Design an enzyme around this catalytic site. Structure first.
Site, PDB file in Angstrom:
ATOM      1  N   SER A 161       8.182  -3.576  -7.827  1.00 29.57           N
ATOM      2  CA  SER A 161       8.308  -3.334  -9.260  1.00 29.57           C
ATOM      3  C   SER A 161       9.676  -3.617  -9.845  1.00 29.57           C
ATOM      4  O   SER A 161       9.789  -3.716 -11.056  1.00 29.57           O
ATOM      5  CB  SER A 161       7.819  -1.929  -9.665  1.00 29.57           C
ATOM      6  OG  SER A 161       8.749  -0.904  -9.324  1.00 29.57           O
ATOM      7  N   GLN A 162      10.716  -3.756  -9.025  1.00 31.76           N
ATOM      8  CA  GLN A 162      11.989  -4.118  -9.620  1.00 31.76           C
ATOM      9  C   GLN A 162      11.876  -5.531 -10.190  1.00 31.76           C
ATOM     10  O   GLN A 162      12.670  -5.900 -11.039  1.00 31.76           O
ATOM     11  CB  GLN A 162      13.185  -3.958  -8.662  1.00 31.76           C
ATOM     12  CG  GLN A 162      13.297  -5.009  -7.584  1.00 31.76           C
ATOM     13  CD  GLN A 162      12.159  -4.929  -6.581  1.00 31.76           C
ATOM     14  OE1 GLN A 162      11.282  -4.064  -6.683  1.00 31.76           O
ATOM     15  NE2 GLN A 162      12.155  -5.839  -5.634  1.00 31.76           N
ATOM     16  N   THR A 212       0.794  -1.219   0.000  1.00 32.07           N
ATOM     17  CA  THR A 212       0.000   0.000   0.000  1.00 32.07           C
ATOM     18  C   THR A 212       0.841   1.290   0.000  1.00 32.07           C
ATOM     19  O   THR A 212       1.858   1.383   0.688  1.00 32.07           O
ATOM     20  CB  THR A 212      -0.884   0.006   1.218  1.00 32.07           C
ATOM     21  OG1 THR A 212      -1.123   1.366   1.600  1.00 32.07           O
ATOM     22  CG2 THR A 212      -0.116  -0.563   2.416  1.00 32.07           C
ATOM     23  N   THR A 244       7.646   2.619  -8.079  1.00 30.78           N
ATOM     24  CA  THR A 244       8.285   3.589  -8.963  1.00 30.78           C
ATOM     25  C   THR A 244       9.364   3.031  -9.889  1.00 30.78           C
ATOM     26  O   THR A 244       9.558   3.511 -11.015  1.00 30.78           O
ATOM     27  CB  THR A 244       8.925   4.698  -8.145  1.00 30.78           C
ATOM     28  OG1 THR A 244       9.893   4.134  -7.242  1.00 30.78           O
ATOM     29  CG2 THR A 244       7.894   5.408  -7.286  1.00 30.78           C
TER      30      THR A 244
END
EC number: 3.5.1.1
Lengths: 307, 304, 326, 309
Positions: free
Chosen positions: D41-42, D12, D72
């Site tokens: 996200s990596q 979250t 990000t």
């Protein structure tokens, strides 16, 4: 080959088809010196003359290219973007370096300037500014550095296109209404309303603003601090001046970002107008035009949210 | 732990921040309570005097302050603070009641900086958005963005990550204890105003200041410090009579240079270099407490 | 007038050009002479002489050119007032930082190039050239580490990088800013690098004939580990990872790098993001895996330091101290 | 109020569901939420991409607009993938946080409010997939991460943002020109895997091994992060020229963060069968190359594709 008109307003930026023989491979180039002054002395007079000319000879050619000094190029471009009714590309260009120095930016700027004016894609995008392989819209563009050849940037929304090897990759176009979609016509005017700018800063004196009111200015543009705020002295002077008919516009000394509507100042209570993303100089170009239409603060704001 | 004195000049910018008890013993006292758009000479002298007066009673100062004229107060303190301890300023671009308010973390980092021994001898410092910026070069670049303060000509001095600072630069112009400016005996400062240049500029504003016997005029020129004709005349004559004129620029970065576009020696004019109009006003003021000779102000303008 | 030596490494950035191989010493010398003649004004600020050390496009820069440049500058230090090196813009930022680390000379060394062909309209070469000479001849440029002068701005070799593919203004120091700006032959210096450079580093390449092998792998969604496995299987002394975000690694890349790091390969975590630092133990537990965080050093630049660090030690903690000092 | 669907892909970004973390959310829309996946996200990958696209293009009719929460690190990559493959015309807005939710001055809460605010605006539609970060609205094609830790790191470095948000209102003054979403030939609804595309970096004394390994394992495409305007180190150039000969798709992009890699400028593209990626950075260009490889392996046609989307 397109016919392109170069309208000079000052000294030469290159050296003209002699100076830049390459121009001949892209268009039929004709030129006429419309006036001759430094751009730091640009005025209402020259402004009116140029829009008039462009509107007059508009069918006599396929596009215009205007050589102009860089000092107030952002002012003139915006005024033409608002007052020109021609549907052919109008391109402004200048030089950061004197045409006689090492690595003069002028000739290539000119060539790119012509190339842009002569591209069919460049039409219907407003008055354009071409500098440093970049195509820029007259509304958002501004001079960001005192000496660097790369100074012209649309700091808020960015460039419209980039130029490589005489080919342009357009990936944007402006949204605000410009040119033939503005209600502005100066074909009939010989003078424009009087609008001035006052700067804010710590301990700001009110004299500058008072002096403007007493001379009976139609309009005052405030270059505020932060999101449009005013120093006490300037505030009082301007609010009473907003009750005696003087149209007061709140803009900002800060170079990027909008001066938002009723956020920092209760514009409603005082009748002030927020410039939005227009810097003092630009907000001034628009106040001037709107003050030839209406004098209603509520109506000027609506103009600032559209053009 | 270090002892840190917070000097507030406005409303709060956080809320507090319990984490601060982890880095220093924090003390504070309101000094004034105004929005920064009404900042003035009085608050200035007051802030400086205090800093120079309690200097030995603390390990470092943090000043909370509104964002509008931060860059002006920063440079003035930069020129007049004689204290050798870290002086750092902070603000918040978002109200403390807001979602994702920046004030709390800005304040923490501000204290971190004043408490770091490496923050000394660097001049007055501004701490915003995890970056340490020097007083001279910092300015507000955007009206609402949290990342608005940048040193647009020469860059930041350090960046902060998890409470440590990577310092890689230090300002070269002279500051704080190396300036001949002492404002202790002062309760008033020379009058310096600013006029804007643009197409068709009126000379009225410039005229009014001159008529009121202002000590100095800063011109926010177009391009590299150039002036619209009317303004140029008014200012040239004004200089002949003994008014200090400084050519600066409305353009946000780059220097306004000596004798490039305007013939400074001929007219008694001063070029501000990279100082913007509002910062140029700060140095001119203090300069006026020392001399009034144009070539001497020009040299001061090349030094600080 | 000061004596400034121009060491060329590739094409001419000002004037018309030779088409000469320039492998011959005498001819290379004649080629740099034509430059002086292409920029007459250069004669008013310094006695300029020079030679052609190499001639290759900068995309093909390599260890050998670097050892040579370094040795040459270190050797001829006494013979001249400063150096100006002409170099292609593609890898200018790599060569500058290597020299920034291995030059022991105390005279100004300044690099310069051009984003426009010298036969182009509004070629930037000529004026860059002039301003590089001014910088090299100014006594205030002394002691500032190796320098890159482009587009009226004086930049330091560590932080400088190319930000745009074609703009004449592409060279910026994106993390800490420039050192000075040049207007009319004068420099406004308001900063100097704080990290140790040139004569203050322990790197001596004077006896070196080759440098430790260091490669660079990229991270992105679904990245393959094959590139990383290829460098390990060939026995590379070190690998630089251009990571995502604050130096993070894709799953398969991590696994390979973890094992590489445990079995002798030096691993530096850097970032593909063009500004900001990749910081220690923030996103990745460096101490547990034996990885090094690069700080504000980008992949190309971090390669340059890992190579030099590997001539001194192979210990990750020692290497980490180095990324924190240089 | 509009019915807005928040699709989450990781932890979250607000909270020290999200509807209770950001009470303000309820004033502007009907929020429904599902956790599609929960990775950092990596580790983003082809499978998640395929999953997300199909989802949106499935429930397109069931809502007023989408808010995807995403890390990000590779945001700029998903953003572009979904920009070529979403067929919904409702607004699909992406958003994340640069500071942990438990952090002092966490940015996630306000970011999210603004994504929802953006997805609920009738104006936000027909502009492609969007990324809303730090009071700004950015198209998924030019948006990219500019700084490793700065909350302001997302910028569209070549063309500028689409709009700015103040007090809940968006001032749009730009729309992206390249074709996106429903105007693309790219359809992934019947796919389970994407062509294999890898990236190699160029730099001084660059090794050819990384390139060779991708070629030997028979990748369909390779993207070069070149030096300058897409130029290649000698050794890498060589390996790549032969790869094309062996029928591998080769795209020249640049390690340089802004500006375009131009066609036949520094490298003779026609002679070797290379495609120049324009303003697409190496990781954005892999995304387009993979898609283009599901339609043709012809260089001349791939190029043209790089010139339209």
């Amino acid at each position: 080959l397109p016919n392109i008109t170069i309208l000079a307003t000052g000294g030469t930026i290159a050296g003209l088809v002699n100076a830049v023989p390459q121009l001949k491979d892209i268009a039929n180039v004709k030129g006429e010196q419309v006036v001759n002054i430094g751009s730091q002395d640009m005025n209402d007079n020259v402004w009116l003359t140029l829009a008039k000319k462009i509107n007059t000879d508009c069918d006599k050619t396929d596009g215009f290219v205007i050589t102009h000094g860089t000092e107030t190029m952002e002012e003139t471009a915006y005024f033409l973007d608002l007052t020109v009714k021609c549907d052919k590309p109008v391109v402004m260009v200048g030089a950061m370096r004197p045409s006689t120095s090492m690595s003069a930016d002028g000739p290539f700027n000119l060539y790119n300037a012509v190339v842009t004016a002569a591209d069919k894609a460049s039409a219907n995008r407003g008055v354009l500014v071409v500098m440093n392989d970049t195509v820029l819209d007259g509304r958002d563009v501004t001079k960001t550095n005192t000496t660097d050849v790369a100074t012209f940037k649309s700091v808020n929304y960015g460039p419209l296109g980039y130029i490589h090897n005489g080919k342009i990759d357009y990936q944007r176009t402006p949204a605000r209404k410009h040119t033939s979609d503005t209600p502005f016509d100066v074909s009939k005017l010989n003078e424009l309303p009087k609008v001035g700018i006052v700067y804010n800063y710590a301990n700001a004196s009110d004299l500058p603003a008072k002096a403007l009111v007493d001379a009976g200015y139609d309009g005052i543009v405030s270059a505020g601090v932060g999101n449009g705020n005013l120093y006490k002295s300037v505030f009082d002077t301007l609010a009473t001046a907003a009750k005696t008919g003087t149209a007061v516009v709140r803009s900002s000394r800060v170079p990027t970002g909008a001066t938002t509507q009723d956020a920092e100042v209760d514009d409603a209570k005082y009748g002030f107008v927020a410039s939005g993303t227009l810097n003092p100089q630009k907000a001034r170009v628009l106040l001037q035009l709107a003050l030839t239409q209406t004098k209603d603060p509520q109506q000027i704001q609506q103009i600032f949210n559209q053009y």
